[PDB]
Amino acid sequence: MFMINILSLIIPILLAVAFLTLVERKVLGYMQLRKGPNVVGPYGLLQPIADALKLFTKEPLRPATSSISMFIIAPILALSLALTMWVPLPMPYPLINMNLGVLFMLAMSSLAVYSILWSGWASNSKYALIGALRAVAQTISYEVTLAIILLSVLLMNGSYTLSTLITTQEHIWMIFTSWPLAMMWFISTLAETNRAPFDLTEGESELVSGFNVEYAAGPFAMFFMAEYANIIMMNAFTAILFLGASHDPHTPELYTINFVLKTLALTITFLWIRASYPRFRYDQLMHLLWKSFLPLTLALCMWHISLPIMTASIPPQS
Amino acid sequence: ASKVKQDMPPPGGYGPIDYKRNLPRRGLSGYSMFAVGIGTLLFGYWSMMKWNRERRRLQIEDFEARIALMP
Numbered sequence: 001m002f003m004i005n006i007l008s009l010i011i012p013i014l015l016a017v018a019f020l021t022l023v024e025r026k027v028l029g030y031m032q033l034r035k036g037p038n039v040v041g042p043y044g045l046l047q048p049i050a051d052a053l054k055l056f057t058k059e060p061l062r063p064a065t066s067s068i069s070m071f072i073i074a075p076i077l078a079l080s081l082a083l084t085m086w087v088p089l090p091m092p093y094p095l096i097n098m099n100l101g102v103l104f105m106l107a108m109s110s111l112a113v114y115s116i117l118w119s120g121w122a123s124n125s126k127y128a129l130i131g132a133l134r135a136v137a138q139t140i141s142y143e144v145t146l147a148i149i150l151l152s153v154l155l156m157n158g159s160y161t162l163s164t165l166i167t168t169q170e171h172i173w174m175i176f177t178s179w180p181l182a183m184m185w186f187i188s189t190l191a192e193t194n195r196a197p198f199d200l201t202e203g204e205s206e207l208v209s210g211f212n213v214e215y216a217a218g219p220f221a222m223f224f225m226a227e228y229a230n231i232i233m234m235n236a237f238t239a240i241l242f243l244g245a246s247h248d249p250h251t252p253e254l255y256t257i258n259f260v261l262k263t264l265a266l267t268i269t270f271l272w273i274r275a276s277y278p279r280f281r282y283d284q285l286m287h288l289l290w291k292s293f294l295p296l297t298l299a300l301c302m303w304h305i306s307l308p309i310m311t312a313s314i315p316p317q318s
Numbered sequence: 319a320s321k322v323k324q325d326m327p328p329p330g331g332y333g334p335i336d337y338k339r340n341l342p343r344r345g346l347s348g349y350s351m352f353a354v355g356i357g358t359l360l361f362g363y364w365s366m367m368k369w370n371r372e373r374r375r376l377q378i379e380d381f382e383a384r385i386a387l388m389p
């Protein structure tokens with residue numbers, strides 16, 4: 001019965017990723033005065049299936065100079081980690097109920113960077129290497145401030161349990177209490193998912209295909225699926241953390257509908273942002289995250305430690 | 319032997335064509351936006367204060383039930 005739950009989680013997520021590819025193409029097309037996919041299937045509804053079937057029937061290449069073991073391990077790690085980061089999300093009930101869900105997401109996301117690191121190194125080509133060192137720099141840029149923002153926001157939750165976030169925001173969204181932290185968190189999640197304007201690792205104009213330039217076919221497809229699953233997962237985490245849906249214990253379907261709508265809106269905002277802006281230089285991302293975000297985050301952390309004590313508004317569950 | 323017919327501009331002249339930059343101001347002042355943000359923050363703080371105190375009372379009640387059941 002638990003395996004049925006695992007499958008009912010992981011298969012719909014892959015289908016959502018497949019159709020998010022089409023939705024992104026159509027949103028970008030219509031923001032660019034064109035249409036996007038509308039031929040293969042009514043309204044391009046069969047385009048993701050054609051893409052997947054073309055990729056998995058295409059020859060996979062193992063580079064002559066590459067390390068083969070790491071070259072094959074990296075996409076497996078990427079996809080499995082992207083699938084695993086979904087299990088503690090309460091929708092309104094989680095698949096795996098943890099005391100410290102937030103720390104689990106933190107650790108698994110910080111493990112996910114080694115997929116890019118090891119694929120870029122194991123390709124044994126120059127553009128892949130440049131992509132990998134850009135990944136190193138990006139993680140160094142965003143990690144500390146991301147963690148401090150999470151701590152500051154959760155100081156009103158009372159714990160690290162994700163389900164407590166539903167009862168914390170029973171009356172008001174957490175975005176009305178910490179909107180500067182919400183802004184910094186949104187930019188941090190854009191940087192954490194290698195999304196425009198922070199899509200430095202791929203670096204398409206600058207680095208051809210970057211870290212995954214050597215990759216082709218099915219192995220290449222796995223990287224794409226992992227990235228888009230990460231997009232959806234991070235936006236769902238943001239929706240749970242800042243726009244809290246109201247949960248009726250006798251009707252969880254209403255909560256599920258509302259939460260799915262909110263995360264879809266955040267994902268569409270990601271696509272909008274990609275369509276609207278140019279790319280950062282990767283030293284400029286580090287300067288932004290270390291000279292503007294970090295001091296404000298430290299000050300707001302001090303403020304959010306002090307405020308519940310001053311106002312006698314400390315949450316329960318020591 | 320009719321009149322010469324050639325592509326030409328119309329009698330009098332064509333309408334004037336705009337070319338200068340046009341970027342309207344289209345925004346509120348900084349004071350208004352800062353005030354709205356601070357007001358939202360204060361409203362959220364006060365609502366959170368009420369809710370957290372209620373939650374503390376509920377936790378005390380549940381702990382008392384556990385204390386009653388312990389022996």
Ligand SMILES: CCCCCCCC/C=C\CCCCCCCC(=O)O[C@H](COC(=O)CCCCCCC/C=C/CCCCCCCC)COP(=O)(O)OCCN
Nearest residue numbers: 180182183184186187197238242273277288292296356359
């Ligand atoms: C009564 C007690 C209250 C205590 C005080 C509380 C009020 C505090 C008010 C200030 C809060 C401001 C928070 C803003 C944090 C960042 C501000 C900032 O300065 O960052 C910018 C940089 O920020 C950015 O430009 C973002 C870059 C990425 C942009 C990507 C697209 C933009 C995002 C679209 C909308 C995002 C919506 C966020 C929230 C979403 C919902 C969660 C600095 O960059 P520069 O202008 O170059 O100058 C620095 C050196 N002089």
